[PDB]
Write a structure and sequence with these properties.
By secondary structure, the chain is an alpha/beta fold. The protein has 13 helices and 23 strands. Helix content is 25%, strand content 24%. Helix 3 packs across helix 4 and helix 4 crosses helix 6. The structure holds calcium ion (CA) (3 copies).
Length: 513
């Protein structure tokens, strides 16, 4: 019993099968067989005895097998549950991209009205809000500055009842957390409503608090393009109106001059200067993407564009970033405080490249001459259809949706494709009843993705409810090129982006041309 139970409760057939196929008759996996697994099934490209041997040295529990360069089923499972068995590429979980191109070539993690913790009309404001966003890797923050008592400028949502905080307090928080998550540059969007005196106080604080982190002069040689994330490493740069406005502030604006959208052009004309940044509401951006997709795209090659949520989103709800990234828009600001598929996709995108907050755009979106238009797809380097097969095998220890300690989840899995319009899809598995510990679906979906370079694959788990709305149990979003193949475990995150230590999905992912 105690053994026959212990094992059964802790037993995974799909794992057994997988080890069997890989190992066959043998009770162990020899390095040669592991390597075959790594290549045949996991499609590792660095697949070779070196990889295999590191896997064993890293994950093999048995001293005998370890020393004798073999992998036991136990070590097989350990590997599969590790960062190396993660569906989200371990290699991409460290900065690995070209960090030397101009800012306009990267998608940049950006926050909207960063100071807010809740809604846009009466909820609270707090430095905490800035701390959290920064800890989530956010690079672009927003400060809405108004005159406050005692000549101390405050921050809050103009014309609302949102609670207030101090501009100075905000600056210290930023100073303290700016680089905790990434070494790359932080951009502070100043929406100045301050009188002239308080503006001067602002400038004083900036200088005093930020000190040398503050970038108050052009980089030497930075002349025809924005500098690179590398060039601005460890800096904080200001975005705002540049000469109503005191010079103290105005002169601190270097590469991010707030500007009204002129139009897209081509030459050293209207389509703003590289050091000029235009903003667009969700609505306006969509329209422009709808009508001048390629113009916008091309514009974004050398220019930074900021998008922000529509005014009706007083609940701090978010729009989908993907639709904007597809246009090359880099500073796509979202309400970082609001849980949802939108932020899920957002942080999934930015977990890439070591979560540094700057993700290099695909080449075709860095080509000032592309004829790309996600909206009107034609032949080009971006067209590269892939057949993605995803098998949702089983789930392990799905978190209790917090809904009575005597109820058991009735989980189902939704798999979605996010990317250019034609590629978007969603599929769902059946519901397993009263099983969150080890539900088994063994269901497979297949998707055709034409522009993988702009896609993300999202796994969502829900607690099915007949009588009501299904509770969100966990989720994981993986950018196409970070999606690992073979047998892998998807590590589920909560609504707030937190890691769920033991909540996983075991899947098999195949990508083919
Ligand atoms: Ca704002
Ligand atoms: Ca139930
Ligand atoms: Ca239910």
């Amino acid at each position: 019993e105690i053994e026959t139970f212990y094992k059964m409760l802790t037993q995974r057939a799909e794992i057994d099968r997988a080890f069997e196929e890989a190992a066959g008759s043998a009770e162990t996996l020899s390095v040669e067989r592991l390597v075959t697994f790594l290549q045949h099934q996991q499609r590792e490209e660095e697949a070779g005895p070196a990889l295999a041997l590191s896997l064993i040295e890293r994950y093999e529990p048995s001293e005998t097998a370890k020393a004798q360069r073999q992998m036991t089923k136990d070590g097989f499972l350990m590997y599969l549950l590790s960062a190396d068995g993660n569906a989200f590429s371990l290699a991409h979980r460290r900065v690995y991209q070209d960090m030397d191109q101009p800012l306009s070539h990267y998608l940049v993690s950006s926050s909207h009205n960063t100071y807010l913790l809740e809604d846009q009309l009466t909820g609270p404001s707090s430095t905490e809000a800035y701390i959290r966003a920064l800890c989530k890797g956010c690079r672009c923050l927003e400060l809405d500055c108004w005159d406050g008592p005692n000549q101390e400028p405050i921050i809050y949502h103009g014309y609302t009842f949102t609670s207030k905080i101090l501009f100075c307090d905000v600056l210290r928080a930023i100073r303290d957390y700016a680089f905790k998550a990434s070494p790359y540059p932080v951009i502070l969007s100043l929406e100045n409503h301050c009188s002239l005196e308080q503006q001067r106080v602002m400038a004083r604080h900036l200088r005093a608090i930020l000190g040398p982190i503050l970038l108050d002069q052009p980089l030497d040689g930075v002349t025809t393009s924005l500098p690179s994330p590398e060039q601005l490493k460890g800096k904080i740069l200001l975005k705002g109106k540049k000469l109503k406005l005191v010079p103290e502030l105005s002169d601190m604006i270097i590469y991010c001059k707030s500007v009204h959208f002129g139009g897209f052009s081509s030459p050293g004309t209207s389509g703003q200067a590289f050091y000029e940044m235009a903003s667009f509401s969700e609505s306006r951006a969509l329209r422009l993407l709808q009508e001048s997709g390629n113009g916008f795209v091309r514009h974004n090659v050398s220019c930074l564009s900021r998008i922000y949520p529509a005014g009706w989103r007083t609940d701090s709800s978010n729009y989908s970033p993907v639709e904007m990234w597809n246009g090359g828009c880099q500073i796509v600001a979202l309400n970082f405080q609001t849980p949802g598929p939108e932020m899920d996709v957002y942080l999934g995108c930015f977990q890439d490249n070591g979560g540094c907050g700057y993700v290099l755009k695909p080449a075709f979106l860095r080509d000032p001459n592309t004829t790309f238009n996600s909206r009107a797809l034609t032949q080009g380097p971006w067209w590269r259809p892939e057949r993605l097969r995803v098998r949702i095998i089983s789930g392990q220890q799905l978190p209790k949706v917090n809904k009575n300690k005597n109820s058991i989840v009735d989980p189902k899995v939704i798999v979605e494709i996010h990317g250019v319009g034609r590629d978007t899809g969603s599929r769902q598995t059946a519901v397993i009843t009263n099983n969150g510990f080890n539900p088994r679906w063994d269901m497979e979906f297949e998707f055709e993705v034409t522009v993988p370079d702009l896609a993300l694959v999202r796994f969502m788990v829900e607690d099915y409810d007949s009588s009501s709305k299904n509770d969100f149990i966990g989720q994981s979003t993986i950018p196409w090129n970070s999606l690992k193949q073979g047998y892998r475990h998807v590590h589920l995150l909560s609504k707030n982006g937190d890691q769920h230590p033991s909540a996983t999905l075991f899947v098999k992912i195949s990508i083919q041309d």
